């Protein structure tokens with residue numbers, strides 16, 4: 001029975017599985033009223049990828065496809081319809097048991113980045129772009145999305161197109177940023193399918209523990225963050241190892257290697273998320289050279305040492 | 308001795324260690340005249356990072372720092388000076404034995420990306436939240452103003468005014484601005500990390516085949532362009548996931564050369580073999596330039612430690 005393990009990469013050596021950002025802090029928010037059901041950064045402890053999760057850090061919130069039509073929006077500038085493929089270039093088959101192409105964004109918001117094209121030496125262009133994932137035109141499970149640009153004309157149709165994500169366009173009221181609200185992958189009247197399950201503590205006094213990254217903004221006021229359940233390197237490790245889960249809950253300890261001291265402990269649940277016994281919201285203050293070490297398999301009734 | 312291993316990753320599951328791009332193809336170019344001495348994606352088989360190599364995919368060709376002021380520069384655009392720190396925010400100490408802050412670009416060219424800022428000061432009427440901005444930007448790494456080992460670089464924008472002095476600044480790389488002759492793209496020419504006319508130091512060593520008939524094998528990614536004609540590529544010696552794997556394993560190297568086989572998981576067959584050298588690079592027996600045409604579900608499997616006398620089966 002291949003023993004279970006976590007990477008020994010430290011906090012300052014990890015990246016977010018839901019947006020291409022470094023991990024900045026560990027974070028809790030016990031009074032969260034939203035159902036937590038993100039679709040990127042989802043992997044079971046025995047290495048099963050779920051939701052829209054894929055392995056490439058470059059694939060998170062990325063799209064590939066081709067533009068088909070230009071449409072001026074009445075309020076939000078120039079829009080472009082885009083057919084999307086899988087990130088490996090193959091056609092996306094909507095009958096596969098996934099919510100949307102792997103890497104599709106998993107939250108409501110205006111995602112800011114750059115659209116680039118290299119024609120089928122070829123000509124090239126790139127421009128800043130925004131994808132409103134709450135729009136009725138955001139239908140990646142149906143093979144098509146829309147993006148908008150400040151550029152009014154220089155986007156070509158029928159040519160290979162890449163979206164490289166960079167941050168958010170805004171977090172104003174009118175920009176519908178909510179990291180826990182899933183897009184409607186097939187449009188508003190259609191149910192999402194093949195989702196990774198929601199996650200929650202099941203024991204009193206526990207809360208979820210997140211790996212938090214602060215996300216850039218194109219403009220406006222705000223200090224937005226994206227919280228993932230496990231960093232991308234954990235997804236990659238678990239997929240590689242595929243170690244059998246010996247119970248439903250692993251016990252992990254956050255350790256300071258220099259002193260060898262454990263700073264706190266957490267439950268790492270089979271479905272791929274952490275809980276801690278903490279009754280406060282906000283960052284965990286601890287060294288970014290610290291790291292989680294697997295201790296032993298426990299169960300849902302194990303009582304964590306309070307933080 | 309802890310056994311040496313590689314990750315199990317098809318080519319379609321790997322990313323470049325020299326720019327944030329997926330690996331697209333394996334590639335050779337035996338008649339390359341340049342010295343190959345890249346500084347990102349450098350790690351020995353026993354897990355020693357070298358050059359400017361760091362572990363985060365988000366840190367490759369990234370900078371963090373603060374804009375100081377707008378500057379005049381004969382070249383087109385609006386120019387800005389920025390101090391740079393280490394990527395983790397701590398001050399860069401030029402006395403450390405590295406060529407430049409980890410993650411600094413390792414090639415000559417006009418690197419295109421986005422500069423973003425989140426102000427330090429907050430506004431009460433905005434919920435005690437800071438103002439933000441982002442704009443497209445270009446960093447010419449051949450410029451005399453590209454001096455990351457001195458803690459300072461310059462970037463240019465199309466935007467003419469909306470970049471703030473004294474505020475935290477991030478550069479997110481996206482591609483190249485141009486590959487015209489006037490944009491000095493050369494993936495094997497290192498920047499002058501301390502400026503015009505200074506010698507770079509603390510470099511990861513150059514790599515080469517030493518056995519007749521062998522050439523370097525690269526993990527190639529095609530890099531986006533802001534404009535112009537071209538199909539530029541960036542070639543790395545090992546993908547970022549191998550750097551990450553070797554760093555964590557730190558398995559002792561039992562000879563100077565690990566024999567690896569590129570295997571198709573579905574067929575089970577070996578497509579070709581290669582030497583994986585101690586300093587962290589591959590050679591193959593091949594006498595042509597261009598892509599290696601093989602499925603992207605293929606992967607390298609470690610077979611055994613051999614020595615430099617070993618003769619590879621021709622590809």
Ligand SMILES: C[C@@H]1O[C@@H](O[C@@H]2[C@@H](O)[C@@H](O)[C@@H](CO)O[C@H]2O)[C@@H](O)[C@H](O)[C@@H]1O
Pocket residue numbers: 218219220221438439440441469
């Ligand atoms: C707070 C500011 O954000 C951006 O300014 C934006 C303006 O350019 C304009 O588009 C309005 C439209 O509603 O939105 C603003 O947010 C930054 O460009 C500026 O520097 C401020 O940080």
